[PDB]
Design a protein around this ligand. Structure first.
Ligand code: HEM
Ligand SMILES: C/C(=C\c1csc(C)n1)[C@@H]1C[C@@H]2O[C@]2(C)CCC[C@H](C)[C@H](O)[C@@H](C)C(=O)C(C)(C)[C@@H](O)CC(=O)O1
Length: 401
């Protein structure tokens, strides 16, 4: 039984996937039209198995997929998930330096400012929603600061980011939870806006600037094409928005749920970094996981997988694998989290890992330092986002009494 859209699954998928993981390393998911890998070692292996491709054009349903949401056709083919291996490496080699911990450190001040202003704006009420009043307003500001886009454009870009991430699932994953017209509008509006931002930066290039750097790469030799560049910036916005919102929300939730964990991070603020990694290890935000496609017929974990068939890596399951993490069903902010696959492995490893950790460190660190007695008002509400165990609301009382 695998029903990742069943009511309750997002809130707590662990009993259901544990049953799966213990019974089998692999199964075919009817509605998902793909194989599903449940165990750490098989999941981890596939990340680094060149037999399994990332490009959706290797899928048996590629035609149906490329035709869906034609406004995103360029992003699908020239984006990081679509480029051929040689081109993918080129693009990553080009942008990776811009995302190191050192490079993104400069954003520290602006992120703190945003976090400060969100807390000042709303901390006074009876009720505070860690999603809508806090987490939701942080990640795009971070990305926009990195892109040197005015705070005025934040809301429109966040809408683009969140819409794009869902739209990319249409025809690929089972149940995208929104009206197509609305999705396409936000995507169109966002791409237009992005075009304007890029044209302006071409007009006024800047020093030590990611976009300027990309634009110069595009102008000079053959290091980056216009479509690759647009697909890259679009993907950065779409990949880095909702993911980070849920990290922040899940972090606060999990620290409210473990007084012992919270107490350790209060005692040793230096543990926050490890705690945030353990949030994704213990309670991974992905509903199912990520996908790969078989480039040829092969046998795997006792299954006969055919060329072009999709495979889902069941991340929240692999990350509860007891052969890899001891006491895997315990949230332990002191554990070694090195083996967590939350940010991927191999050439496609998430470039935003440092930016995400920084944003969450500032956001989660600040809220608990400023309101150390914060308490859950009532059970968080979860939704049916096709990719995420999305928290819709996380209502708290900042200073209870
Ligand atoms: C906040 C928590 C985040 C998580 C849990 C996360 C997770 C992941 C994972 C698992 C992958 C690999 C998917 C695969 O291999 O199929 C990935 C890739 C990617 N991530 Fe993140 N990410 C996060 C934040 C960010 C941020 C903040 C950005 C941008 C600022 C970002 C940009 C990207 C991009 C562009 C890719 C595609 C990489 C490639 O295919 O070469 N992510 N992310
Ligand atoms: C938009 C995007 C990445 C990207 C880079 S280049 C390109 C095109 N897209 C982000 C990545 C994000 O870090 C994770 C969870 C990537 C999550 C990994 C996989 C790819 C997703 O869960 C996948 C099956 C999905 O459910 C959909 C709905 C298709 C995704 O949009 C979810 C989604 O939001 O994907």
């Amino acid at each position: 039984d695998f029903k990742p859209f069943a009511p309750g699954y997002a809130e707590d998928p662990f009993p259901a996937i544990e049953r799966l993981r213990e019974a089998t390393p692999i199964f075919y998911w009817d509605e998902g039209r793909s194989w599903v890998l449940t165990r750490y070692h098989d999941v981890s292996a596939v990340f680094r198995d060149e037999r399994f491709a990332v490009s959706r054009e290797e899928w048996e349903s590629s035609a149906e997929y490329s035709s869906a949401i034609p406004e995103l056709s360029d992003m699908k083919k020239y984006g990081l998930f679509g480029l051929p291996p040689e081109d993918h490496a080129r693009v990553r080699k080009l942008v990776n330096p811009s995302f190191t911990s050192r490079a993104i450190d400069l954003l520290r001040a602006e992120i703190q400012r945003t976090v400060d202003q969100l807390l000042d704006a709303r901390s006074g009420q009876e009720e505070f929603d860690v999603v809508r009043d806090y987490a939701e307003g942080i990640p795009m500001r971070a990305i926009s600061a990195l892109l040197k886009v005015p705070a005025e454009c934040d809301e429109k870009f966040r809408r683009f980011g969140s819409a794009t991430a869902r739209a990319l699932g249409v025809g690929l994953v089972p149940r995208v939870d929104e009206e197509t017209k609305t999705l396409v509008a936000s995507v169109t509006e966002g791409l237009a806006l992005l075009h304007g931002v890029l044209d302006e930066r071409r007009r006024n290039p800047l020093e030590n600037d990611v976009l300027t750097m990309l634009l110069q790469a595009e102008a000079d030799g053959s290091r980056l094409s216009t479509k690759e560049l647009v697909a890259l910036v679009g993907a950065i916005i779409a990949a880095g928005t909702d993911t980070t919102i849920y990290l922040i929300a899940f972090a606060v939730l999990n620290l409210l749920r473990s007084p012992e964990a919270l107490e350790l991070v209060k005692a040793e603020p230096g543990l926050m970094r490890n705690a945030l990694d353990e949030v994704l290890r213990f309670d991974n935000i992905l509903r199912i996981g990520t996908v790969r496609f078989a480039r040829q017929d092969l046998e795997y974990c006792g299954a006969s997988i055919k060329k072009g068939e999709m495979v889902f890596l069941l991340i929240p399951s692999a990350l509860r694998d007891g052969t890899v993490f001891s006491r895997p069903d315990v949230f332990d902010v002191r554990r070694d989290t090195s083996a967590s696959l939350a940010y991927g492995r191999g050439p496609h490893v998430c470039p935003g890992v440092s930016l995400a950790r920084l944003e969450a460190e500032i956001a989660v660190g600040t809220i608990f330092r400023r309101f150390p007695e914060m308490k859950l008002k009532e059970t968080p509400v979860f939704g049916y986002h096709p990719a995420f165990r999305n928290i819709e609301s996380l209502n708290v009382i900042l200073k209870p009494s």
